[PDB]
Design a protein around this ligand. Structure first.
Ligand code: T3F
Ligand code: T3F
Ligand code: T3F
Ligand code: T3F
Ligand code: 1YJ
Ligand code: 1YJ
Ligand code: NA
Ligand code: NA
Ligand code: NA
Ligand code: NA
Lengths: 398, 398
């Protein structure tokens, strides 16, 4: 009967909480929610919803301050805590950097902006200061040259979650070891350091720096970078070097804009994600390939969570799914309610009366055992619509 | 064969010096910077050197028309247009390890950013800013306590070598060039720092703020200020105040302690004027108690007087001994080339006390050096009629 307060948001809060509920069923869990948590699952899960849907008490921070014999774990919590208000000193935080670097804000952007090759997540003690307390455990993260800030945020969430899981016992049982943070290389960025109201690309900068600006500001659900009004989804560095002043527009067609920089010219790729989603209903890979400038655009998602592979499956675009998956697409990709490819494919099967592509999907690793966020399999769904015939067909592949 | 040297400071002067020694063949032409006052300062006036050594001063427009020359920029203040030349032998010394830190304030920015290294780079000039192909380069290690001025001087010293070690190949067309890498290329325009409006930022880590101090410590432009008080470096404390970053925890006459994001910082009031005044007559024990940042012992006033210089003029042998034990240059010079030995002779002359000289010489005093009029200490004594001091000082030469 230990107690834990989980304060925070997003898949990290939700996933730590379920690990706790799966593996530590006699703990008392209390929750604090971020101010801007809407109760609606988005590109991240709502932690507030998860808690309402799993009878987890939501409390205030003032309540939390009073609870005794509780550990306090912050997972992307929106508040600077006052440690001395607590009874105890068992206050912890995952921070999304390799501390002591990159204390504070926008750790998905700054390391990219500054040109880093790596970052990390850090488990540490909460003291009065911002991401300043003693370090318990850390993990280095490689940032790939092609990765955006959104790509990086996902690795923080994913790696942060495992870091917590792999140490939380020691937090609960006071087995853990801490070490004050170094002086050397400590760095911090406040909220003023980037104005997300007033983004503008700075072209009086190197090709490296401009691509890094792009990468760092590519996070579609907040924004994409813009050039003369029009959204951009990555780019590349050309071998030419224009005599025109940095920022000068050398060329502009339907796919791309070419620009002078301090050094090498760059091409900026027009965001054509919407066009591509639309095209993934019926078009073959030959066609989709011609639209593809940055390869990673194939794994983007609209507001519903629809990726290309998802829209493909819904329309029964089997050969397109073969190619998407060959390019890296998740065969069991999910929307923002956890609806799998298989579930989308099921509606196709049912509308069309054609079940013959299921084998070939299965052969690509499609998993029918998966549950959406209300714990329903694709089978449960066939039961509730009364399509027992298809349910029995699909069962053959288990 | 002809060479156009366009630039300023001891880099331009000493390169020119070396050429007039080792390459008596060459016709030299100079271009000077707009803020070369004609008068020696902490750096030698190149304009002055060219007037005193029969080198015609010309404009950049003139330099475009000179055939059969190479063009060598050594902190030249202008963006040149390669295409207006009759040839392509266009070279520059840039004060960074290219391709990082193109552009401006390269003695500030690597420090601000926390770099342990920088360097100098010989490269071809093309239309862009520090963008052309690399011919040679040298890493410079930035010691943890070196200021921007320390870094600047090393840039001057190391770029001087790098030119001398390579200039024949530039005059003979036997040099190799390699295009600059895309990756890590970085650049800072003049707008990136407003030197008329410098403001210490304590919403930062201790590391960052010391580095701000170091970066803006370049005395003959400016020192950083806290409440109109000039500051000469500082240190990082083990305490971590709870007060908001930038709160003054302590004030006295030697120092100011401030809260940061992480560790508290000690800021040292500038007491160089005081210290220089104490150097005339006080002993090492007094002077050591006045010192906070050790490198303040090497600072110079407007005349080019350091501590060891003031000590030598006033006959303070014990203090010289110690100054040197702490790393001071036994042969330090003012801005006219006048050496320690030349100040100490003045003292020997006026006091009649000749006693300290032997020890000084064992510590390194070099009587053979010449000022910027090509006078040794002996030439002055000879003119003076001081036969006895002439003889006596000559007895100690090694
Ligand atoms: C606000 C915002 C963020 N982003 C990117 C950069 C961020 O690193 C990433 C995540 O944004 P975010 O609002 O989740 O917050 P971050 O600023 O990453 O994390 C801070 O805020 C959290 C709530 C915690 O207090 C955390 N300990 C803080 O360091 O999204 C945008 O692209 N556009 C935006 O407008
Ligand atoms: C992918 C896709 C979906 N849709 C439809 C199907 C859904 O009924 C509706 C909402 O999409 P959504 O991703 O929010 O779906 P969800 O509500 O998450 O999933 C429901 O619909 C699926 C098709 C399965 O039947 C599942 N069993 C349902 O619970 O939009 C399209 O019209 N075009 C599309 O390209
Ligand atoms: C202007 C200025 C400079 N500084 C420091 C920072 C600089 O790195 C250092 C030297 O100043 P600086 O004006 O000589 O030039 P920097 O900005 O170093 O060098 C650029 O300007 C030169 C004239 C050349 O064109 C060179 N190619 C450029 O790199 O002094 C101050 O501390 N306060 C100041 O107000
Ligand atoms: C270092 C120092 C110098 N002085 C004086 C000595 C000079 O007469 C005057 C100008 O200083 P400076 O460094 O510009 O001297 P310079 O003009 O460089 O050198 C002359 O004066 C020296 C003392 C030697 O005789 C030398 N051989 C001369 O060429 O200031 C002081 O009063 N207090 C001092 O602490
Ligand atoms: N005590 C304390 N509280 C914490 C942590 C800590 O390690 N110490 N760790 C987590 C970090 N949480 C944050 C960090 C920063 C903000 C934030 O909002 N920062 C603004 C604050 C500006 C301001 O304070 O005015 C900024 O840095 O620009 C919000 C939650 C959770 N709470
Ligand atoms: N061609 C060209 N000319 C050169 C070099 C070069 O490699 N290419 N190498 C040297 C670098 N000299 C400089 C570099 C920048 C400035 C300067 O003043 N820059 C302002 C820009 C002024 C402007 O363009 O508006 C800035 O960078 O913010 C002055 C001399 C000298 N001449
Ligand atoms: Na902001
Ligand atoms: Na260009
Ligand atoms: Na400026
Ligand atoms: Na503090």
């Amino acid at each position: 009967h230990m107690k834990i307060i989980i304060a925070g948001k997003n898949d990290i809060a939700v996933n730590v909480t379920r690990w706790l509920q799966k593996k530590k069923k006699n703990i008392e869990i209390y929750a604090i929610c971020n101010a801007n948590d809407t109760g609606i699952d988005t590109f991240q899960r709502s932690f507030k919803k998860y808690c309402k849907d799993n009878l987890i008490p939501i409390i205030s921070l003032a309540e939390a301050y009073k609870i005794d014999d509780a550990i306090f774990l912050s997972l992307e919590f929106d508040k600077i805590v006052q440690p001395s208000k607590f009874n105890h000193n068992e206050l912890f935080n995952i921070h999304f950097s390799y501390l002591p670097k990159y204390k504070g804000m926008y750790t998905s952007a700054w390391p990219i902006l500054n040109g880093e090759d790596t970052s990390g997540v850090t488990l540490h003690k909460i003291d009065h200061g911002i991401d300043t307390g003693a370090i318990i455990a850390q993990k280095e993260i490689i940032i790939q040259p092609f990765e955006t800030a959104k790509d990086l945020y996902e690795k923080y969430i994913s790696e942060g979650t495992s870091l917590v899981i792999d140490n939380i016992s020691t937090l609960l049982n006071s087995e853990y070891v801490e070490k004050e943070q170094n002086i050397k290389y400590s760095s911090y960025y406040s909220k003023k350091t980037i104005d997300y109201s007033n983004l503008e690309l700075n072209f009086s900068k190197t090709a490296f720096e401009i691509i890094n600006q792009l990468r760092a500001f590519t996070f579609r659900e907040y924004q994409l970078p813009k050039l003369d009004g029009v959204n951009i989804f990555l780019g590349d560095v050309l071998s030419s070097r224009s005599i025109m002043k940095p920022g000068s527009i050398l060329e502009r067609n339907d796919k791309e804009i070419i620009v002078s920089t301090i050094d090498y010219d760059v091409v900026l790729y027009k965001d054509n994600f919407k066009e591509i989603l639309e095209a993934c209903k019926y078009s073959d890979s030959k066609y989709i390939a011609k639209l593809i400038r940055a390869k990673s655009i194939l794994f983007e998602k609209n507001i519903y969570g629809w990726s290309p592979v998802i829209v493909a499956a819904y329309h029964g675009n089997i050969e397109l799914i073969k190619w998407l998956v060959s390019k890296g697409a998740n065969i069991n990709d999910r929307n923002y309610k956890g609806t799998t490819v298989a579930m989308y494919f099921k509606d196709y099967m049912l509308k069309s009366g054609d079940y013959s592509g299921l084998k070939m999907l299965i052969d690509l690793g499609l998993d029918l055992t998966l549950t959406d966020y209300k714990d329903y399999t694709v089978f449960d769904y066939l039961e509730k619509s009364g399509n027992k015939n298809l349910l029995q067909y699909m069962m053959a592949f288990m």
